[PDB]
Protein backbone atom coordinates (compact mmCIF):
# COMPACT_ATOMS: atom_id res chain seq x y z
CA UNK A 1 0.00 0.00 0.00
CA UNK A 2 1.82 3.05 -1.32
CA UNK A 3 1.73 6.68 -0.25
CA UNK A 4 -1.21 8.71 -1.59
CA UNK A 5 -0.32 12.41 -1.84
CA UNK A 6 -1.01 15.00 -4.51
CA UNK A 7 1.80 15.49 -7.06
CA UNK A 8 2.46 19.07 -5.94
CA UNK A 9 3.20 18.04 -2.35
CA UNK A 10 6.61 16.46 -3.06
CA UNK A 11 7.35 19.14 -5.67
CA UNK A 12 11.02 20.07 -5.61
CA UNK A 13 11.69 23.80 -5.40
CA UNK A 14 15.11 24.99 -6.57
CA UNK A 15 29.97 9.50 -8.42
CA UNK A 16 30.11 6.17 -10.27
CA UNK A 17 30.37 2.76 -8.60
CA UNK A 18 31.55 -0.44 -10.31
CA UNK A 19 29.55 -3.68 -9.97
CA UNK A 20 30.51 -6.65 -7.85
CA UNK A 21 29.85 -9.87 -9.75
CA UNK A 22 28.99 -13.36 -8.47
CA UNK A 23 28.29 -16.38 -10.70
CA UNK A 24 26.75 -19.40 -9.00
CA UNK A 25 24.01 -22.01 -9.16
CA UNK A 26 20.85 -22.00 -7.06
CA UNK A 27 21.49 -25.55 -5.78
CA UNK A 28 24.68 -27.64 -5.57
CA UNK A 29 25.51 -28.74 -9.10
CA UNK A 30 24.72 -32.32 -10.11
CA UNK A 31 25.46 -33.44 -13.66
CA UNK A 32 22.20 -34.34 -15.38
CA UNK A 33 20.06 -32.57 -12.74
CA UNK A 34 18.31 -29.35 -13.75
CA UNK A 35 19.34 -26.23 -11.84
CA UNK A 36 19.50 -22.44 -12.16
CA UNK A 37 22.59 -20.46 -13.15
CA UNK A 38 22.77 -17.06 -11.45
CA UNK A 39 24.74 -13.88 -12.08
CA UNK A 40 24.36 -11.40 -9.22
CA UNK A 41 25.55 -7.83 -9.81
CA UNK A 42 25.44 -5.34 -6.94
CA UNK A 43 26.96 -2.14 -5.64
CA UNK A 44 26.95 -0.35 -9.00
CA UNK A 45 25.87 3.13 -10.10
CA UNK A 46 24.44 4.24 -12.51
CA UNK A 47 21.80 1.56 -13.06
CA UNK A 48 22.55 1.09 -16.78
CA UNK A 49 24.22 -2.31 -17.13
CA UNK A 50 24.59 -5.11 -19.70
CA UNK A 51 24.74 -8.69 -18.40
CA UNK A 52 25.13 -11.88 -20.44
CA UNK A 53 25.18 -15.52 -19.38
CA UNK A 54 27.66 -17.50 -21.48
CA UNK A 55 27.69 -21.21 -22.34
CA UNK A 56 30.76 -22.59 -24.15
CA UNK A 57 31.73 -19.22 -25.60
CA UNK A 58 28.34 -17.94 -26.71
CA UNK A 59 25.33 -16.12 -25.31
CA UNK A 60 22.53 -18.01 -23.57
CA UNK A 61 19.31 -17.04 -25.30
CA UNK A 62 16.57 -16.98 -22.62
CA UNK A 63 17.99 -15.10 -19.62
CA UNK A 64 15.66 -13.41 -17.12
CA UNK A 65 16.51 -10.78 -14.53
CA UNK A 66 14.97 -9.41 -11.36
CA UNK A 67 13.37 -5.99 -11.03
CA UNK A 68 15.79 -3.14 -10.42
CA UNK A 69 16.23 -2.27 -6.75
CA UNK A 70 18.89 -0.46 -4.72
CA UNK A 71 20.56 -0.69 -1.32
CA UNK A 72 20.78 1.80 1.54
CA UNK A 73 23.78 3.52 -0.08
CA UNK A 74 21.65 3.92 -3.29
CA UNK A 75 23.78 1.41 -5.24
CA UNK A 76 21.81 -0.93 -7.48
CA UNK A 77 21.59 -4.72 -7.56
CA UNK A 78 20.17 -7.23 -10.04
CA UNK A 79 19.93 -11.00 -10.37
CA UNK A 80 20.27 -12.56 -13.83
CA UNK A 81 19.29 -16.21 -14.06
CA UNK A 82 18.38 -19.06 -16.40
CA UNK A 83 17.40 -22.70 -16.03
CA UNK A 84 20.15 -25.09 -17.09
CA UNK A 85 21.24 -28.71 -16.76
CA UNK A 86 25.02 -28.80 -16.21
CA UNK A 87 27.06 -31.56 -17.82
CA UNK A 88 30.73 -32.49 -17.50
CA UNK A 89 31.87 -30.68 -20.65
CA UNK A 90 29.80 -27.49 -20.50
CA UNK A 91 31.41 -24.29 -19.19
CA UNK A 92 29.52 -21.22 -18.01
CA UNK A 93 30.35 -17.60 -17.28
CA UNK A 94 28.79 -14.18 -16.81
CA UNK A 95 29.80 -11.08 -18.77
CA UNK A 96 29.09 -7.61 -17.37
CA UNK A 97 29.49 -4.28 -19.16
CA UNK A 98 29.22 -0.99 -17.29
CA UNK A 99 30.28 2.62 -17.75
CA UNK A 100 32.95 2.04 -15.08
CA UNK A 101 34.63 -0.74 -17.12
CA UNK A 102 37.07 -0.14 -19.97
CA UNK A 103 36.00 -3.52 -21.41
CA UNK A 104 33.36 -6.11 -20.46
CA UNK A 105 34.33 -8.28 -17.49
CA UNK A 106 33.92 -12.06 -17.58
CA UNK A 107 33.52 -14.09 -14.38
CA UNK A 108 33.46 -17.85 -14.91
CA UNK A 109 31.26 -20.30 -13.03
CA UNK A 110 33.38 -22.48 -10.73
CA UNK A 111 31.32 -25.67 -10.79
CA UNK A 112 33.04 -27.01 -7.64
CA UNK A 113 31.93 -24.03 -5.53
CA UNK A 114 11.48 -11.03 14.81
CA UNK A 115 11.19 -7.55 13.35
CA UNK A 116 9.46 -6.83 10.05
CA UNK A 117 9.50 -4.08 7.43
CA UNK A 118 7.73 -2.78 4.34
CA UNK A 119 9.79 -0.86 1.77
CA UNK A 120 9.09 0.88 -1.54
CA UNK A 121 11.87 1.74 -4.00
CA UNK A 122 11.52 4.08 -6.99
CA UNK A 123 14.10 4.74 -9.71
CA UNK A 124 13.70 7.19 -12.61
CA UNK A 125 16.44 7.51 -15.25
CA UNK A 126 16.22 10.17 -17.95
CA UNK A 127 16.83 9.23 -21.60
CA UNK A 128 17.00 12.52 -23.52
CA UNK A 129 15.53 12.22 -27.00
CA UNK A 130 14.57 8.57 -26.49
CA UNK A 131 11.33 9.49 -24.70
CA UNK A 132 10.11 9.74 -21.12
CA UNK A 133 12.36 8.54 -18.28
CA UNK A 134 12.60 4.84 -17.46
CA UNK A 135 10.62 4.36 -14.24
CA UNK A 136 10.76 1.21 -12.09
CA UNK A 137 9.05 0.75 -8.72
CA UNK A 138 9.32 -2.27 -6.42
CA UNK A 139 7.71 -3.12 -3.08
CA UNK A 140 9.17 -5.34 -0.37
CA UNK A 141 8.00 -7.00 2.82
CA UNK A 142 11.22 -7.97 4.65
CA UNK A 143 13.38 -9.53 1.87
CA UNK A 144 10.39 -10.65 -0.24
CA UNK A 145 9.40 -8.58 -3.26
CA UNK A 146 5.63 -8.55 -3.74
CA UNK A 147 4.79 -5.78 -6.26
CA UNK A 148 6.47 -4.07 -9.19
CA UNK A 149 5.91 -1.49 -11.90
CA UNK A 150 7.93 -0.96 -15.08
CA UNK A 151 7.20 2.00 -17.34
CA UNK A 152 8.55 0.03 -20.31
CA UNK A 153 6.29 -2.99 -19.67
CA UNK A 154 3.11 -3.50 -21.65
CA UNK A 155 0.51 -3.74 -18.88
CA UNK A 156 1.05 -0.24 -17.39
CA UNK A 157 -0.29 -1.72 -14.14
CA UNK A 158 1.16 -2.51 -10.75
CA UNK A 159 1.87 -6.22 -10.92
CA UNK A 160 2.02 -8.96 -8.28
CA UNK A 161 5.34 -10.60 -7.48
CA UNK A 162 4.29 -12.74 -4.48
CA UNK A 163 1.51 -15.34 -4.25
CA UNK A 164 -0.24 -13.77 -1.24
CA UNK A 165 -0.72 -10.38 -2.92
CA UNK A 166 -2.67 -11.99 -5.78
CA UNK A 167 -5.59 -12.39 -3.35
CA UNK A 168 -6.21 -8.64 -3.59
CA UNK A 169 -9.14 -7.45 -5.68
CA UNK A 170 -9.45 -4.90 -8.48
CA UNK A 171 -9.99 -1.94 -6.13
CA UNK A 172 -6.57 -2.58 -4.57
CA UNK A 173 -4.76 -2.88 -7.90
CA UNK A 174 -6.57 0.15 -9.33
CA UNK A 175 -5.45 2.28 -6.39
CA UNK A 176 -1.89 0.96 -6.46
CA UNK A 177 -1.67 1.53 -10.23
CA UNK A 178 -3.05 5.06 -9.84
CA UNK A 179 -0.60 5.87 -7.04
CA UNK A 180 2.46 4.38 -8.74
CA UNK A 181 1.76 6.43 -11.88
CA UNK A 182 1.61 9.55 -9.70
CA UNK A 183 4.97 8.59 -8.18
CA UNK A 184 6.26 8.32 -11.76
CA UNK A 185 4.91 11.73 -12.81
CA UNK A 186 6.49 13.37 -9.76
CA UNK A 187 9.87 11.79 -10.50
CA UNK A 188 9.79 12.86 -14.16
CA UNK A 189 9.07 16.47 -13.20
CA UNK A 190 11.82 16.31 -10.57
CA UNK A 191 14.32 15.09 -13.18
CA UNK A 192 13.67 18.15 -15.32
CA UNK A 193 13.66 20.41 -12.26
CA UNK A 194 16.92 19.02 -10.84
CA UNK A 195 18.72 19.55 -14.16
CA UNK A 196 17.92 23.25 -13.85
CA UNK A 197 18.90 23.53 -10.18
CA UNK A 198 22.33 22.12 -11.11
CA UNK A 199 22.64 23.78 -14.56
CA UNK A 200 23.20 20.52 -16.43
CA UNK A 201 22.99 19.81 -20.14
CA UNK A 202 19.80 18.46 -21.68
CA UNK A 203 21.70 15.62 -23.39
CA UNK A 204 22.98 13.79 -20.31
CA UNK A 205 21.25 10.96 -18.47
CA UNK A 206 20.46 11.41 -14.79
CA UNK A 207 18.96 9.25 -12.05
CA UNK A 208 16.44 10.05 -9.31
CA UNK A 209 15.84 7.59 -6.47
CA UNK A 210 13.12 7.55 -3.81
CA UNK A 211 12.70 5.18 -0.86
CA UNK A 212 10.26 5.01 2.03
CA UNK A 213 8.78 2.48 4.41
CA UNK A 214 8.26 1.45 8.00
CA UNK A 215 9.65 -1.05 10.52
CA UNK A 216 7.76 -2.90 13.25
CA UNK A 217 9.00 -5.08 16.08
CA UNK A 218 8.11 -8.67 16.85
CA UNK A 219 4.96 -7.21 18.46
CA UNK A 220 4.03 -5.59 15.10
CA UNK A 221 4.19 -2.10 16.67
CA UNK A 222 5.83 0.85 14.95
CA UNK A 223 9.62 1.13 15.34
CA UNK A 224 10.99 3.49 12.67
CA UNK A 225 9.96 5.20 9.45
CA UNK A 226 11.96 6.22 6.38
CA UNK A 227 11.62 8.66 3.50
CA UNK A 228 14.79 9.38 1.52
CA UNK A 229 15.65 10.94 -1.83
CA UNK A 230 18.75 10.89 -4.03
CA UNK A 231 19.97 12.47 -7.27
CA UNK A 232 22.63 10.65 -9.32
CA UNK A 233 23.40 8.32 -6.44
CA UNK A 234 24.05 11.06 -3.87
CA UNK A 235 21.88 12.02 -0.90
CA UNK A 236 19.54 14.90 -1.74
CA UNK A 237 16.93 15.21 1.05
CA UNK A 238 15.95 12.74 3.76
CA UNK A 239 13.42 12.68 6.59
CA UNK A 240 15.07 12.30 9.98
CA UNK A 241 14.31 9.47 12.40
CA UNK A 242 11.84 11.62 14.35
CA UNK A 243 9.85 12.12 11.10
CA UNK A 244 9.45 15.83 11.94
CA UNK A 245 12.48 17.48 10.27
CA UNK A 246 14.55 17.14 7.10
CA UNK A 247 18.22 16.52 6.33
CA UNK A 248 19.32 18.52 3.29
CA UNK A 249 22.65 17.73 1.64
CA UNK A 250 23.47 20.85 -0.39
CA UNK A 251 22.17 24.32 -1.21
CA UNK A 252 19.56 23.09 -3.70
CA UNK A 253 18.13 20.68 -1.12
CA UNK A 254 17.94 23.49 1.46
CA UNK A 255 15.48 25.37 -0.75
CA UNK A 256 13.29 22.27 -1.05
CA UNK A 257 13.57 21.85 2.72
CA UNK A 258 12.15 25.33 3.33
CA UNK A 259 9.41 24.80 0.73
CA UNK A 260 8.53 21.50 2.42
CA UNK A 261 8.69 22.90 5.97
CA UNK A 262 6.28 25.69 5.02
CA UNK A 263 3.89 23.39 3.12
CA UNK A 264 4.00 20.81 5.96
CA UNK A 265 5.08 17.76 3.97
CA UNK A 266 6.73 15.91 6.87
CA UNK A 267 3.44 15.85 8.78
CA UNK A 268 1.65 14.16 5.88
CA UNK A 269 4.43 11.57 5.61
CA UNK A 270 4.47 10.77 9.34
CA UNK A 271 0.75 9.94 9.20
CA UNK A 272 1.46 7.36 6.49
CA UNK A 273 4.63 5.90 8.00
CA UNK A 274 3.22 5.61 11.53
CA UNK A 275 -0.31 4.67 10.49
CA UNK A 276 -1.12 3.45 6.99
CA UNK A 277 2.24 1.77 6.36
CA UNK A 278 2.05 -0.12 9.66
CA UNK A 279 -1.59 -1.10 9.10
CA UNK A 280 -1.06 -2.69 5.68
CA UNK A 281 2.22 -4.31 6.72
CA UNK A 282 0.28 -6.23 9.38
CA UNK A 283 -2.29 -7.14 6.73
CA UNK A 284 0.48 -8.47 4.48
CA UNK A 285 2.15 -10.38 7.32
CA UNK A 286 -1.19 -12.05 8.05
CA UNK A 287 -2.16 -12.82 4.45
CA UNK A 288 1.29 -14.19 3.62
CA UNK A 289 2.01 -15.85 6.95
CA UNK A 290 3.08 -19.12 5.31
CA UNK A 291 5.73 -17.18 3.37
CA UNK A 292 6.60 -14.07 5.36
CA UNK A 293 6.53 -15.39 8.95
CA UNK A 294 8.89 -18.29 8.19
CA UNK A 295 12.56 -18.50 9.11
CA UNK A 296 14.91 -20.86 7.29
CA UNK A 297 18.05 -21.62 9.27
CA UNK A 298 21.29 -21.57 7.24
CA UNK A 299 22.67 -24.97 6.28
CA UNK A 300 26.35 -24.56 7.16
CA UNK A 301 29.52 -26.44 6.23
CA UNK A 302 39.36 -21.59 5.15
CA UNK A 303 35.86 -20.92 3.77
CA UNK A 304 32.72 -20.85 5.93
CA UNK A 305 29.55 -21.53 3.92
CA UNK A 306 25.94 -20.60 4.73
CA UNK A 307 23.15 -21.59 2.35
CA UNK A 308 19.38 -21.58 1.92
CA UNK A 309 18.50 -19.18 4.73
CA UNK A 310 15.80 -16.53 5.20
CA UNK A 311 15.72 -13.69 6.07
CA UNK A 312 18.89 -12.35 4.46
CA UNK A 313 20.39 -10.61 7.52
CA UNK A 314 23.31 -12.70 8.77
CA UNK A 315 26.76 -12.29 10.33
CA UNK A 316 29.79 -14.41 9.41
CA UNK A 317 32.97 -13.62 11.35
CA UNK A 318 36.26 -15.53 11.53
CA UNK A 319 38.26 -15.77 14.75
CA UNK A 320 39.39 -12.34 6.00
CA UNK A 321 37.19 -11.93 2.91
CA UNK A 322 33.39 -12.09 3.10
CA UNK A 323 31.20 -11.94 0.00
CA UNK A 324 27.94 -10.02 -0.25
CA UNK A 325 24.85 -12.02 0.67
CA UNK A 326 23.29 -13.23 -2.56
CA UNK A 327 19.83 -14.47 -3.61
CA UNK A 328 19.53 -18.13 -4.55
CA UNK A 329 16.53 -17.22 -6.73
CA UNK A 330 13.95 -19.31 -4.85
CA UNK A 331 13.42 -16.96 -1.89
CA UNK A 332 16.47 -18.06 0.12
CA UNK A 333 19.94 -16.54 0.38
CA UNK A 334 23.59 -17.63 0.36
CA UNK A 335 26.85 -16.33 1.81
CA UNK A 336 30.41 -17.35 2.58
CA UNK A 337 33.49 -15.81 4.18
CA UNK A 338 37.22 -16.50 4.11
CA UNK A 339 43.05 -22.55 15.69
CA UNK A 340 40.37 -20.65 13.76
CA UNK A 341 36.60 -20.56 14.23
CA UNK A 342 33.67 -19.19 12.22
CA UNK A 343 30.78 -17.50 14.02
CA UNK A 344 27.28 -17.57 12.52
CA UNK A 345 24.53 -15.27 13.82
CA UNK A 346 21.08 -15.54 12.24
CA UNK A 347 17.49 -14.97 13.34
CA UNK A 348 16.55 -18.57 12.47
CA UNK A 349 19.14 -19.97 14.93
CA UNK A 350 18.52 -20.64 18.64
CA UNK A 351 22.03 -19.45 19.56
CA UNK A 352 25.08 -18.50 17.48
CA UNK A 353 26.80 -21.53 15.97
CA UNK A 354 30.55 -22.14 15.75
CA UNK A 355 32.34 -23.93 12.91
CA UNK A 356 35.87 -25.22 13.51
Amino acid at each position, epitope marked *: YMLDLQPETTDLGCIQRTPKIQVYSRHPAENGKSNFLNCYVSGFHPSDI*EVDL*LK*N*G*E*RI*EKVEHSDLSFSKDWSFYLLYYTEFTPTEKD*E*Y*ACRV*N*H*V*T*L*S*Q*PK*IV*KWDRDMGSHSMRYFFTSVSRPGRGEPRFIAVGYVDDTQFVRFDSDAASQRMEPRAPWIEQEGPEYWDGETRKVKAHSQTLRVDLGTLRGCYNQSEAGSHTVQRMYGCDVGSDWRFLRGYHQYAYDGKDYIALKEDLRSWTAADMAAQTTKHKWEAAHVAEQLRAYLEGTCVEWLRRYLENGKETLQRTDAPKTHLRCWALSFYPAEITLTWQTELVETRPAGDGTFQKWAARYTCHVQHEGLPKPLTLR
Partner: nanobody
Amino acid sequence: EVKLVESGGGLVQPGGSLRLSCAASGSIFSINTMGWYRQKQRDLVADISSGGSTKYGDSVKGRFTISRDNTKNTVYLQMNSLKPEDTAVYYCYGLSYSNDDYWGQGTQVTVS
Protein backbone atom coordinates in the same frame (compact mmCIF):
# COMPACT_ATOMS: atom_id res chain seq x y z
CA GLU B 1 47.27 -18.10 -28.19
CA VAL B 2 44.76 -16.55 -30.60
CA LYS B 3 45.50 -13.57 -32.85
CA LEU B 4 42.77 -11.42 -34.39
CA VAL B 5 43.62 -9.69 -37.68
CA GLU B 6 41.42 -6.67 -38.39
CA SER B 7 40.99 -4.63 -41.56
CA GLY B 8 38.55 -2.32 -43.31
CA GLY B 9 38.50 0.88 -41.26
CA GLY B 10 39.22 4.45 -42.22
CA LEU B 11 37.45 7.60 -43.33
CA VAL B 12 33.99 7.77 -44.91
CA GLN B 13 31.42 10.46 -45.72
CA PRO B 14 28.14 10.64 -43.76
CA GLY B 15 25.61 8.23 -45.21
CA GLY B 16 28.38 6.07 -46.66
CA SER B 17 29.28 2.51 -45.80
CA LEU B 18 32.25 0.39 -44.74
CA ARG B 19 32.96 -3.34 -44.43
CA LEU B 20 35.06 -4.41 -41.47
CA SER B 21 36.56 -7.89 -41.33
CA CYS B 22 38.21 -9.92 -38.57
CA ALA B 23 40.13 -13.17 -39.04
CA ALA B 24 41.05 -15.43 -36.13
CA SER B 25 44.32 -17.36 -36.03
CA GLY B 26 45.01 -20.79 -34.60
CA SER B 27 42.64 -23.73 -34.57
CA ILE B 28 39.08 -23.41 -35.85
CA PHE B 29 38.21 -25.27 -32.63
CA SER B 30 39.40 -22.38 -30.44
CA ILE B 31 36.90 -19.58 -31.20
CA ASN B 32 33.11 -19.52 -30.91
CA THR B 33 31.56 -16.04 -30.78
CA MET B 34 33.21 -13.28 -32.81
CA GLY B 35 32.17 -9.66 -33.06
CA TRP B 36 32.87 -5.98 -32.47
CA TYR B 37 32.73 -3.50 -29.63
CA ARG B 38 33.38 0.20 -30.19
CA GLN B 39 34.91 2.90 -28.03
CA LYS B 40 35.68 5.23 -21.08
CA GLN B 41 33.65 2.11 -21.83
CA ARG B 42 33.26 0.18 -25.07
CA ASP B 43 29.79 -0.69 -26.35
CA LEU B 44 28.55 -3.78 -28.18
CA VAL B 45 28.15 -3.30 -31.92
CA ALA B 46 27.48 -6.83 -33.18
CA ASP B 47 28.60 -10.40 -32.60
CA ILE B 48 27.81 -13.84 -34.00
CA SER B 49 28.31 -17.39 -32.80
CA SER B 50 29.75 -20.27 -34.81
CA GLY B 51 26.15 -21.40 -35.39
CA GLY B 52 25.13 -18.03 -36.83
CA SER B 53 23.27 -16.55 -33.85
CA THR B 54 23.57 -12.76 -34.00
CA LYS B 55 23.14 -9.88 -31.57
CA TYR B 56 23.21 -6.14 -32.26
CA GLY B 57 23.49 -3.03 -30.15
CA ASP B 58 20.45 -0.78 -30.23
CA SER B 59 22.23 2.17 -31.85
CA VAL B 60 23.24 0.16 -34.95
CA LYS B 61 20.22 -2.14 -35.37
CA GLY B 62 18.98 -2.16 -38.97
CA ARG B 63 22.02 -0.38 -40.42
CA PHE B 64 24.79 -2.82 -39.45
CA THR B 65 24.94 -6.46 -40.51
CA ILE B 66 27.39 -9.10 -39.27
CA SER B 67 28.11 -12.33 -41.15
CA ARG B 68 30.52 -15.24 -40.92
CA ASP B 69 32.48 -17.51 -43.24
CA ASN B 70 31.52 -21.15 -42.71
CA THR B 71 35.04 -22.46 -43.41
CA LYS B 72 37.38 -20.05 -41.64
CA ASN B 73 36.91 -18.22 -38.33
CA THR B 74 36.39 -14.90 -40.10
CA VAL B 75 33.55 -12.41 -39.61
CA TYR B 76 32.47 -9.36 -41.59
CA LEU B 77 30.64 -6.20 -40.47
CA GLN B 78 28.72 -4.30 -43.16
CA MET B 79 28.20 -0.80 -41.71
CA ASN B 80 25.59 1.12 -43.73
CA SER B 81 24.19 4.64 -43.36
CA LEU B 82 27.05 5.86 -41.19
CA LYS B 83 26.65 8.92 -38.96
CA PRO B 84 29.24 11.12 -37.20
CA GLU B 85 28.23 9.49 -33.90
CA ASP B 86 29.49 6.18 -35.34
CA THR B 87 33.06 7.53 -35.20
CA ALA B 88 35.09 5.33 -32.84
CA VAL B 89 37.78 2.68 -32.64
CA TYR B 90 36.08 -0.64 -33.42
CA TYR B 91 37.57 -3.59 -31.52
CA CYS B 92 37.19 -7.11 -32.84
CA TYR B 93 36.79 -9.77 -30.16
CA GLY B 94 36.31 -13.50 -29.82
CA LEU B 95 35.24 -16.01 -27.20
CA SER B 96 36.79 -19.44 -26.79
CA TYR B 97 34.58 -22.41 -25.99
CA SER B 98 35.80 -21.96 -22.39
CA ASN B 99 34.65 -18.30 -22.25
CA ASP B 100 38.10 -16.75 -22.62
CA ASP B 101 37.97 -13.42 -24.45
CA TYR B 102 40.49 -12.24 -27.04
CA TRP B 103 40.68 -8.65 -28.26
CA GLY B 104 42.12 -7.10 -31.40
CA GLN B 105 44.01 -3.83 -31.56
CA GLY B 106 41.06 -2.01 -33.12
CA THR B 107 40.43 -0.06 -36.32
CA GLN B 108 39.60 3.64 -36.32
CA VAL B 109 36.40 4.56 -38.17
CA THR B 110 35.75 8.25 -38.82
CA VAL B 111 32.60 9.70 -40.41
CA SER B 112 33.02 13.29 -41.65
